[PDB]
C-alpha cells in the first residue's frame, strides 16, 4: 500500500487538496459527478465511526464508571475530582457563550419531534430491556444503565466472597478491552481518514459554494478563541489565587502541551505529562495518581468542543435551542467528556452521544451531512482540544499539591 | 440522605402510611391529584424492576443450568434433587387449590385507563411448541419474549458444563471464564435489586397509594384475600408435606421445628435465603447431620428448591387472570406448574427476586408486561409483595433442612 | 434412554427406512398425518440450525480472525477471497451453459445499483445488526474486530494485554459451546431427518414431471460437472490428490448433503480439515468464512432457475441481462446464509434485478414450482458449496 505517511500531515493534505478540487468543481464540471463518484467514499468513512459508537459508548462508560465510584478513593482525589468536575462544568458554559457571540450554522441552513410532559423522558432515561435499548440506537438510557452497572461492579469487588470478587474483575475486564479493541479500529479508521475526509469536504465544497468556508472558519474561531479564554480566564486565574507563578508554569509545560497538540492523544502523551510534573516540584504519590486519572477523565477541551458543535448543528438546521434543553448540553457534554477516550477521533464520536440527547438522531439525513462537516474539519479542532485537555491535568495537579 | 433505616420496617411504614393517605384522598381531594403527582414515582420503581428482568432471567438461568447438569453430581445429590423436584412440584399444585377455594381477583375486574385487556388465542400447538425454540438468540434476548430465552439459556448452561470435562485445556479454560462472565453479570444485577429495594419505600408508597385512591376499599378486601390464600397454603404445605414426610422416615417433627427455630425466623425477617445460609448451616449441626451431607445440600438448597415462591407465583397468576376476568384453561393451567417450578429454580433468594420471576411465569401463557392492564394488576402484587415475601422465605429455608434431615436418614 | 447408536448409521437407518415407511404409508394411508404429527418433528430439527448460525458465525470468525494475527497479517485471506470470487464467477458461467444445453421453460410458456450495497457491507450498529438477521456486516465487523484484539495482545501494557485474552476467551467457548450443541442436534437428526424426508417422499420427486426434471437434469449433471471441470482441475495443478481428497471429505459432504445446512455441517468440515493435515489457524478461518460466502452450488442453481423462469415465460434473455445474471447470481450466493430455505428466496433479487418482480403473478407463481422442487434440489446444492471451500483451503494452504 506504501501509505506510511504521518497521519496528521497525510490528512492535512487531503483537507487542503480536497478543498480546492471541490471549488474547481464548484464551477466547471458540475454537481452530479461528485455526488456519485467521490461522496460514496465519504459515507464509508463516516459509517465506520457510526459503527463504533454504540459499543464504545456502552463499554467506555462502564469502564469509566468503575474507575470513579465514590468512595473508592482517598481524599487526595476528592479535591481534584471536584476540581475536575468544575473545570469541565464551566468549560462548556463558556462554549455556549462562544456559540452565542459567534453564531455558526445560522445562515448555512440546508425536522424533529416535540417533548412529552417531562414525566415520560425523565422516566425514559431508564431502559425497559437493557439489550433492546443497547440493540437499536437509543443512546440516552444506554448511558444511565451502563453507569448503574459500572458502579454495581465496584461493589462486587469489595464483597467478602472470593468467587464474587473474581466474578467482578473478569466481567469488568471483558468490557474493558472490548473498550480498548474499539480504539485500534478507530485508529484503523484514521488510516482511512485521509481518503475519507477528502471525499467529504470535497462534496461540501462543490455544493453550498464558499459560504461553508466562511462558516467553517466561524466555528474554528468560536472554538479556538474560547479555548485560549479558558486558559486565561480559568487556568491563569485559579493559578494566581494559590500562589503559583502562571507564566513559568507554561514554560515547564511547554513540551507537555505541544507534544499533545501534534499527537492529539492524551492517553499517548501521558509519559510526557508525567515527566513535566517532576520538573516543577510535584510530589510522587500525587502525580502518579492525578495524571493517570486526568488522562481519561476531565476533557474540558472536548466538553467545550461539543457544546459549540451542537449549536452549529442546531443553527445549521435553523432550530432554536431552548433552555431546559440548553442546560441538558452542559449536563451531557461533561458526561460525554468523561467518557471520551483521549485519541484522534474520540471526541467527534462522543458528540453523537450529546446529539441523541436533546432529540437529534443520526439516522436522520440532515444530521448526517451537518455532522460530516464538523467531522471533516474535526482534525483541526482536535489538536488544540488535546492541548487544553492536557493543560487541565497539570494545572489541577499543581493546585492539589499546594493544599496537601 | 440520612435514610439509613432497616429496609423491612422502613418499607412497612410506607405501606401502612401509604394506605391511609390513599383512603383519605379516596374521598376529599379527588382522583386526579394522585394520578399525576404520586404515581409517576411508582412507575419508576416498577420500571426499575422491569429493567432487570431480561438480563437476570438470562444470566440466572445459565448459572442455574450449569449448577445442576446431570450427571455432574454424586448419587448423594440424586436423592435430594428428586426430593427438591417433587417438593417444589406439588407446592404450586397446592397453590392452584388455594387459588381455587379462594378466588382472588375475581370481583376486582378492571380496565384502568380505558383499555379492557383482550389477550390473543393459541396456534394449533405446533407453532408454540416450536416457538419455544428461538430463531436468533440475540433478537429473542433483545426485545422481550421470555419463553425461548429460557429454553436456549438452559441449553447453553448445559453445553458449558460439557466444555469443562473436554480434554483440551484451553477449551476447559474457555468454559470457566465465559461462565463466570455470565456469573457476576448474574450477581451484579442483585446489587441493583438491593439498590432498588432502597427506593422501595418511596416506590411502594406511591403505588398502593394510587390503588387506595381508585378502586376504593374493595382492593383491601381482595389484597387480604390473596394474603390469606397464600399464608394458609404455606402452613398447609408445612403440615401436609413436611410434617407428613418427616413422620414416614422416623424423624420427630415437633422438635425439628425447635431446632430450626432460629433458621426460620431469621429467614422470615431478612427475606434473604442466600443471606440466611450460615444460620441454616449452624442449625444443621445442632440436630445430628453429617458434614459431607449438609455442606452439599444447603448450598444447593440456597438457590434451588424455592417451594415458598413456586406456590407464591402459582397464586399470584390466578390473581392477575381473575383480576382481568379471564378464565384459565387446563393445558395452560398445567403450564403454570411447569413454569413456576423453573421460575422457582431460577429465583435468587433475595428481597425482590420472586416478584420479578413472576413476570417470567406471566409472559408464558400469553400475558406480556408491555400491556397496560398487566402493569397495574402486577403493581398491586408488587406493593404487598414485601409481606408475602417474608413467609415465603421462611418456607424456602424449611424445605432445605427437612430434605437435609431426610436424605441423611437413607445414607 | 437406550438411544446411543453411532449417527453414521442411526440416521442411515432413519433415511433408508425414511424411504420405506414414507412411500408405503405414502400410498393409501389417508389422514395426511405426515404434515401434522411427523413434520412437527422435522421442522423442530431445522429450527435448531437456524438458532445456531448467527452466534457460531460471529463467535468463530472473531476467533479465526484472532489467530491469523500476522500469519500473513491477514493477507492469507486476500488470496482465498479471490479464490472465492472466481469459483463462484465461473460456477454461474457453467450454469449459463447448463441452461443453454438444457431448456427447462418453453413448450409451457405463457402470460399467466451497486453503491449502497457495498456500503451496506458495513454495519450501522453491531448489536442492532447482530440482533435481528443481517449477515454480511456481522462478518465484516467480527473480522475487523478479530484483527484489532490481537494488537491488544502484544501491546506493552500488562492489564490491557490481559483485557484481550479474557474477552477473547469469552468469545471462544461461546464459540465451542455452540458447536457441541450442533451435535446434540445431530443426535436428534435421525428423528429429525426421518420426519422431514417423510414429507419429501409422499409428494415431491415424481412431480410435474419433465419441465421440472428438465431443471433437475441441468442441475445434477452440472453440479457434478462443476467438480470435474473445476475442482479436480485445480486439485491437480496444485499437487493435491483428487482421489483421497474426496475420501478425506467422505463424511463431511455426505452429512452436508442430507442436512442441507452449511453452518450445521461446519463442525464436521473442520473435523475433516484436521484429517487432511491442515493447520488450525488457516482452517479455523477460511472454512467459517467460506461457510457463508462462496456458495457456488447456489450461484449455479440460481442462474438455471432464472433462465427456467425466463424460458417458461416466452420472453428470452439478451446477452445484456445474461451478463448481469452472471453478475447478480454471485452476489446472491454472497448474501445467502447457508440454511435450507434461503436458496430459492435469495434467488429473488437475481430476478428483481434484470427485472422480473414477484408482483406480476406469472412470476410469484412459476417461481413457486422451482420453490416446490427446491426441497430435493437443496440437498445437491449444499454439498457443492462446502467442497468448493475445503478445496480452496487446501490449495491456499499449499502456498504457505
Ligand atoms: N484526541 C483528544 C480527545 C478527543 O478527541 O476528544 C485527546 O487525546 O485529548
Ligand atoms: N427473597 C426470597 C426469594 C423470593 O423472593 O422469591 C428468599 O430469600 O427466600
Ligand atoms: N442450505 C444451503 C443453502 C441454500 O441453498 O439455501 C447450504 O447450507 O449450503
Ligand atoms: Na474521558
Ligand atoms: Na484529559
Ligand atoms: Na433459585
Ligand atoms: Na431455598
Ligand atoms: Na459455502
Ligand atoms: Na453467502
From Swiss-Prot, chain B:
Q: Which domain of life is it from?
A: Archaea
Example GO BP: chloride transmembrane transport
Q: Where do the TM regions start and end?
A: 7-25, 37-57, 76-98, 117-155, 192-213, 226-246, 293-315, 387-407
> Can you name a GO cellular component term?
plasma membrane
Topological domain (Cytoplasmic) residues are: 58-75, 156-191, 247-255, 285-292
Presence of keyword Transmembrane: yes
Q: How does it sit in the membrane?
A: Multi-pass membrane protein
Its subcellular locations are: Cell membrane
Q: Per the annotation, which location comes first and is thus the protein's main one?
A: membrane
Which residues hold L-aspartate?
A: 271-273, 309, 350, 389, 396
- Could you list this entry's UniProt keywords, alphabetically sorted: Amino-acid transport, Cell membrane, Chloride, Membrane, Metal-binding, Sodium, Symport, Transmembrane, Transmembrane helix, Transport
Residue positions binding Na(+) 2:
303, 347
Start-end of intramembrane regions = 256-284, 333-367
Q: Name one Pfam family in it.
A: SDF
Q: Does the keyword Metal-binding apply?
A: yes
Which of the residues are on side Extracellular? 26-36, 99-116, 214-225, 316-332, 368-386
Role summary: Sodium-dependent, high-affinity amino acid transporter that mediates aspartate uptake. Has only very low glutamate transport activity. Functions as a symporter that transports one amino acid molecule together with two or three Na(+) ions, resulting in electrogenic transport. Na(+) binding enhances the affinity for aspartate. Mediates Cl(-) flux that is not coupled to amino acid transport; this avoids the accumulation of negative charges due to aspartate and Na(+) symport. In contrast to mammalian homologs, transport does not depend on pH or K(+) ions.
Q: Which family does it belong to?
A: Belongs to the dicarboxylate/amino acid:cation symporter (DAACS) (TC 2.A.23) family.
Q: How does it assemble?
A: Homotrimer.
**Entry's free-text remark on domains:** Contains eight transmembrane regions plus two helical hairpins that dip into the membrane. These helical hairpin structures play an important role in the transport process. The first enters the membrane from the cytoplasmic side, the second one from the extracellular side. During the transport cycle, the regions involved in amino acid transport, and especially the helical hairpins, move vertically by about 15-18 Angstroms, alternating between exposure to the aqueous phase and reinsertion in the lipid bilayer. In contrast, regions involved in trimerization do not move.
What is this protein's name? Glutamate transporter homolog
Amino acid at each position: 500500500k506504501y501509505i506510511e505517511y504521518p497521519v496528521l500531515q497525510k490528512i492535512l493534505i487531503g483537507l487542503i487538496l480536497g478543498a480546492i478540487v471541490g471549488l474547481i468543481l464548484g464551477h466547471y464540471g458540475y454537481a452530479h459527478a461528485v455526488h456519485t463518484y467521490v461522496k460514496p467514499f465519504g459515507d464509508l468513512f463516516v459509517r465506520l465511526l457510526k459503527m463504533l459508537v454504540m459499543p464504545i459508548v456502552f463499554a467506555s462508560l462502564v469502564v469509566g464508571a468503575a474507575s470513579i465510584s465514590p468512595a473508592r478513593l482517598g481524599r487526595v482525589g476528592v479535591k481534584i475530582v471536584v476540581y475536575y468536575l468544575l473545570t469541565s462544568a464551566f468549560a462548556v458554559t463558556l462554549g455556549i457563550i462562544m456559540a452565542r457571540l459567534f453564531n455558526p450554522g445560522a445562515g448555512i441552513h440546508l425536522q424533529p419531534h416535540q417533548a412529552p410532559p417531562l414525566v415520560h423522558i425523565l422516566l425514559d432515561i431508564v431502559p425497559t430491556n437493557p439489550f433492546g435499548a443497547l440493540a437499536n440506537g437509543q443512546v440516552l438510557p444506554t448511558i444511565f444503565f451502563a453507569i448503574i452497572l459500572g458502579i454495581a461492579i465496584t461493589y462486587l469487588m469489595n464483597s467478602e466472597n472470593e468467587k464474587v470478587r473474581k466474578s467482578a474483575e473478569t466481567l469488568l475486564d471483558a468490557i474493558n478491552g472490548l473498550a480498548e479493541a474499539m480504539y485500534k479500529i478507530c485508529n484503523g479508521v484514521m488510516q482511512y481518514a485521509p481518503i475519507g475526509v477528502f471525499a467529504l469536504i470535497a462534496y461540501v465544497m462543490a455544493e453550498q459554494g464558499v459560504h461553508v468556508v466562511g462558516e467553517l472558519a466561524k466555528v474554528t474561531a468560536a472554538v479556538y478563541v474560547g479555548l485560549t479564554l479558558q486558559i486565561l480566564l480559568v487556568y491563569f486565574v485559579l493559578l494566581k489565587i494559590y500562589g503559583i507563578d502562571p507564566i513559568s508554569f507554561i514554560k515547564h509545560a511547554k513540551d507537555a502541551m505541544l507534544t499533545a497538540f501534534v499527537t492529539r492523544s492524551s492517553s499517548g502523551t501521558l509519559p510526557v505529562t508525567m515527566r513535566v510534573a517532576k520538573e516543577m516540584g510535584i510530589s510522587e504519590g500525587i502525580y502518579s495518581f492525578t495524571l493517570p486519572l486526568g488522562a481519561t477523565i476531565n476533557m474540558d477541551g472536548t466538553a467545550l468542543y461539543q457544546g459549540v458543535a451542537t449549536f452549529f448543528i442546531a443553527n445549521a438546521l435553523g432550530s432554536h435551542l431552548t433552555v431546559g434543553q440548553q442546560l441538558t448540553i452542559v449536563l451531557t457534554a461533561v458526561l460525554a467528556s468523561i467518557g471520551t477516550a483521549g485519541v484522534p477521533g474520540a471526541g467527534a464520536i462522543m458528540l453523537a452521544m450529546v446529539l441523541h440527547s436533546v432529540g437529534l438522531p443520526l439516522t436522520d439525513p440532515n444530521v448526517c451531512a451537518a455532522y460530516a462537516m464538523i467531522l471533516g474539519i474535526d482534525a483541526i479542532l482536535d489538536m488544540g482540544r488535546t492541548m487544553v485537555n492536557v493543560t487541565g491535568d497539570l494545572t489541577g495537579t499543581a493546585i492539589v499539591a499546594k493544599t496537601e
